[PDB]
Design a binder for this molecule. Structure first.
Ligand SMILES: Nc1ncnc2[nH]cnc12
Length: 287
């Protein structure tokens, strides 16, 4: 943290709570210079213990990313016993939220997948592995732009460390080599993307009704999941390409951006505003 800043309230105004993050709460805020809205993740360092390792990793990684497909980072500010991590505000909800009212259509699935793939291509080109790709960590602006979020367990490859081995992620989305703690790389995110495609198509990842400890033996043992149901052949084949138990046979993000499913079905991100509006209507009438 060679660039930690101080006195954040002199540049930002903290508003209301808009959620809970991995390490504390998330608040809406305002940049007093531009009047744009921002998101502020506030972490009580007193409370943080061994999490500090990951909190430190989260900031490092956010600070090193500059992509329209990754939540922008404004800075980290020290305040009493609190660290304020100030980020891009995205008011459209997560892709998981957007699935709550009902199924997506294939154009929406492809559009969201294309944007996630652009974010993965960026991260992977920077030798970063997200490690927690799932619909909950794909956030949308109110006009439909899609960005990856939640870098708390991200991994960084370097010239001397070409693979990672840490067990991290969310069980249902974890690649088999991550569960086995084998040496893995960005291909683990391609498996998670395949699971996320099934999640965007069906609403939930494979084995979602099982206790997570159970999936830790099911994923390495069983054949890989496939997309079942009445879905187009290119979507089913997209899922199959990602969900190969041999990582080296999974395509890269750059290769998947050329997949027939994406080319035939992805449209402008602005049309995703219809899904954002569907969620707002559904949330408003939810009893
Ligand atoms: N949880 C969140 N809600 C809104 N915008 C965000 N930007 C980063 N995390 C966010």
């Amino acid at each position: 943290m060679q660039n930690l800043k101080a006195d954040p309230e002199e540049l930002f105004t903290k508003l209301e709570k808009i959620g809970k993050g991995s390490f504390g709460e998330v608040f809406k805020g305002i940049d007093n210079r531009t009047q744009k809205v921002v998101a502020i993740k506030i972490i009580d360092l007193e409370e943080a213990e061994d999490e500090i390792e990951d909190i430190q990793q989260e900031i490092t990684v956010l600070s090193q990313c500059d992509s329209p497909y990754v939540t922008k980072y404004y800075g980290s500010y020290l305040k009493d016993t609190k660290l304020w991590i100030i980020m891009e505000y995205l008011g459209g909800g997560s892709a998981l939220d957007l699935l709550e009212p009902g199924p997506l259509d294939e154009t929406q699935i492809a559009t969201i997948l294309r944007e996630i793939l652009k974010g993965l291509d960026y991260l992977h080109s920077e030798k970063k592995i997200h490690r927690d790709i799932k619909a909950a960590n794909v956030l949308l602006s109110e006009h439909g732009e899609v960005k990856l979020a939640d870098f708390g367990v991200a991994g960084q490859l370097t010239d001397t460390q070409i693979k990672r081995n840490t067990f991290v992620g969310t069980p249902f989305w974890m690649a088999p080599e991550v569960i086995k703690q084998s040496a893995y790389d960005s291909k683990a995110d391609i498996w998670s993307l395949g699971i996320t495609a099934i999640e965007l198509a069906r609403g939930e990842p494979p084995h979602s009704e099982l206790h997570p400890m159970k999936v830790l033996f099911l994923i390495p043992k069983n054949n890989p999941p496939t997309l079942e149901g009445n879905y187009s052949k290119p979507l089913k084949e997209f899922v199959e390409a990602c969900l190969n138990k041999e990582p080296s046979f999974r395509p890269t993000a750059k290769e998947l951006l050329k997949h027939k499913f994406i080319l035939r079905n992805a449209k402008k991100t602005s049309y995703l505003t219809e899904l954002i509006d569907r969620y707002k209507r559904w949330k408003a009438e939810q009893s």
